[PDB]
Structure 1
Amino acid sequence: PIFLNVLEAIEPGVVCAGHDNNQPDSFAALLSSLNELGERQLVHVVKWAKALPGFRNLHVDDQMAVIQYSWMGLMVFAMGWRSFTNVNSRMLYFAPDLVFNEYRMHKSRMYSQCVRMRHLSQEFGWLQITPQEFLCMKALLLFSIIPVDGLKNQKFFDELRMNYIKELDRIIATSCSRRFYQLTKLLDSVQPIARELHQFTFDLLIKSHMVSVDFPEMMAEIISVQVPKILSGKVKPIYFHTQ
């Protein structure tokens, strides 16, 4: 299980948000902490991605683009997994020091988005997703959103995505057909959630001053340069099933 060995080996560890749980729950503090959590996770996602089998075959500009477009989905998926394995989807486990209960989902002004995320988390249980399945699915998420006009070296990307899809089917192995169908359906469901968060973070960045919400360096640049390309339709997610 060479492929599975690698994915398990490179899987990022625990990342705290640095939230002061002693201070009252407020939109400002919660979102600021989420943004800081995102900055920290971004660092881990970059190291993880670059250590993925074949990732370095991609053109260098494509390497960063793929990461900059797929980070929302990747982080939402892993967070849903953490919520499943830690609190059985009861709450959203963003970090050990930033767990969202219903009250926080409301104060964050992202209640509808959190609902979709908790639903995603519940799916891990309803589908009995295995740790091994989780890992391959997460890897595939990195190769699930690109420029409609293509990447610098689209062929390298296509071969890479193909091989990761084949690995998912592999660990899966009538029954297998049902399983693959279900996991690809689950993967597709991540995209709508990611787009809602893209829209939300974009709007929040634009009015960040007014509501006292702080965005760290990497987050601000990516959200003002990359995210708009997605919201304007220049960059679109890759779906398995027709939407």
Structure 2
Amino acid sequence: PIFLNVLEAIEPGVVCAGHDNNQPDSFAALLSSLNELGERQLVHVVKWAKALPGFRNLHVDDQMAVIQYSWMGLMVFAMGWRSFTNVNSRMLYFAPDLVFNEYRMHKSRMYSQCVRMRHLSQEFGWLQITPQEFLCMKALLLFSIIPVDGLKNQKFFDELRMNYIKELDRIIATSCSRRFYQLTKLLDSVQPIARELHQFTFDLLIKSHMVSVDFPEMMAEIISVQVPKILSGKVKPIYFHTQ
């Protein structure tokens, strides 16, 4: 009840990209629309995270830090879920007005990364992931990437992460063992994908002026101030299993 009640209650609603589906697809248009969508989803991720059980237990600087580091993974995971429930993983459901078919995957020059995301979407089906498991996993995803040097108050974070793992346990509760194994394996699989996208969005920002791709305010800041911490190895994801 309680824990799951909250997660269901705070789950972000539908978010549109504002893409003009009347114009023929193009690299600059598609990626710019994705960037706008990302900015819009970031606002929802912030509202969502600040409302999570026990989030205020974290030092304020850590609250902002984990959101910024986990942003990509959170979006990827939710998108995969949306693609699974809406189009049964046939296409990438970024938004109602921004659905990626093979042609767009190609036109966006993000084909390889889209293939990875589509595979993740397919796993929700192959694993018969329930909406309740999805909710708990996504919440745990927010607490799955931290600085190797530690956070301002690592202890409050460790405590919070531990409790979310316990909640996943309960939702699951030799079948419990196997379920926990595949769900943690699934969660781990998000990280390599998020890294690929981190590299891609970083390179895109650096050359955005040359390819006519627009980056919203917060995104440009986060991608140039925080993401490089991840790409340079200062900030790393927390894996359940050894990669």
Given the two structures, how large is their TM-score scaled by the length of structure 1? 1.00
Q: Give the gaps of 5 or more residues in structure 1.
A: none
User: What's the counterpart of residue 120 of structure 1?
Assistant: 120
Give the C-alpha shift of residue 236 in structure 1.
0.2
Give the C-alpha shift of residue 2 in structure 1.
0.2
Q: Give the gaps of 5 or more residues in structure 2.
A: none
Q: Cα deviations across residues 50-82 of structure 1 (Å, max 9, x unaligned)?
A: 000000110000000000000000000000000
Give the C-alpha shift of residue 162 in structure 1.
0.1
CA distance in 2, matches of 1:159, 1:75: 24
CA distance in 2, matches of 1:154, 1:190: 23
Give the C-alpha shift of residue 33 in structure 1.
0.3
Give the C-alpha shift of residue 92 in structure 1.
0.1
- Quote the RMSD (CA, aligned, Å): 0.3
Give the C-alpha shift of residue 31 in structure 1.
0.2
CA distance in 2, matches of 1:238, 1:222: 20
Give the C-alpha shift of residue 189 in structure 1.
0.1
Give the C-alpha shift of residue 100 in structure 1.
0.1
Counterpart of 1:94 in 2: which secondary structure?
strand
User: What's the counterpart of residue 39 of structure 1?
Assistant: 39
Q: Cα deviations across residues 115-165 of structure 1 (Å, max 9, x unaligned)?
A: 000000000000000000000000000000000000000000000000000
Give the C-alpha shift of residue 192 in structure 1.
0.1
User: What's the counterpart of residue 87 of structure 1?
Assistant: 87
CA distance in 2, matches of 1:64, 1:24: 38
User: What's the counterpart of residue 129 of structure 1?
Assistant: 129
Tell me how many residue pairs correspond in the alignment. Answer: 243
CA distance in 2, matches of 1:169, 1:111: 35
1:184 aligned onto 2:184: yes
CA distance in 2, matches of 1:64, 1:18: 27
CA distance in 1, matches of 2:153, 2:221: 24
Counterpart of 1:209 in 2: which secondary structure?
helix
CA distance in 1, matches of 2:84, 2:74: 16
Give the C-alpha shift of residue 27 in structure 1.
0.5
CA distance in 2, matches of 1:23, 1:157: 46
Give the C-alpha shift of residue 173 in structure 1.
0.5
Give the C-alpha shift of residue 107 in structure 1.
0.4
Counterpart of 1:17 in 2: which secondary structure?
coil
Give the C-alpha shift of residue 205 in structure 1.
0.1
Give the C-alpha shift of residue 103 in structure 1.
0.1
Counterpart of 2:211 in 1: which secondary structure?
coil
Give the C-alpha shift of residue 8 in structure 1.
0.1
Give the C-alpha shift of residue 166 in structure 1.
0.5
Give the C-alpha shift of residue 185 in structure 1.
0.0
Equivalent runs, 1:209-220 vs 2, <5 Å: 209-220=209-220
Instruction: Find runs of 4+ consecutive structure 1 residues off by over 4 angstroms.
Output: none
Give the C-alpha shift of residue 212 in structure 1.
0.1
CA distance in 2, matches of 1:71, 1:170: 26
Give the C-alpha shift of residue 47 in structure 1.
0.4
Q: Cα deviations across residues 72-102 of structure 1 (Å, max 9, x unaligned)?
A: 0000000000000000000000000000000
User: What's the counterpart of residue 67 of structure 1?
Assistant: 67
User: What's the counterpart of residue 140 of structure 1?
Assistant: 140
Counterpart of 2:233 in 1: which secondary structure?
coil
Give the C-alpha shift of residue 10 in structure 1.
0.1
Given the two structures, how large is their TM-score scaled by the length of structure 2? 1.00
Give the C-alpha shift of residue 233 in structure 1.
0.1
Counterpart of 2:24 in 1: which secondary structure?
coil
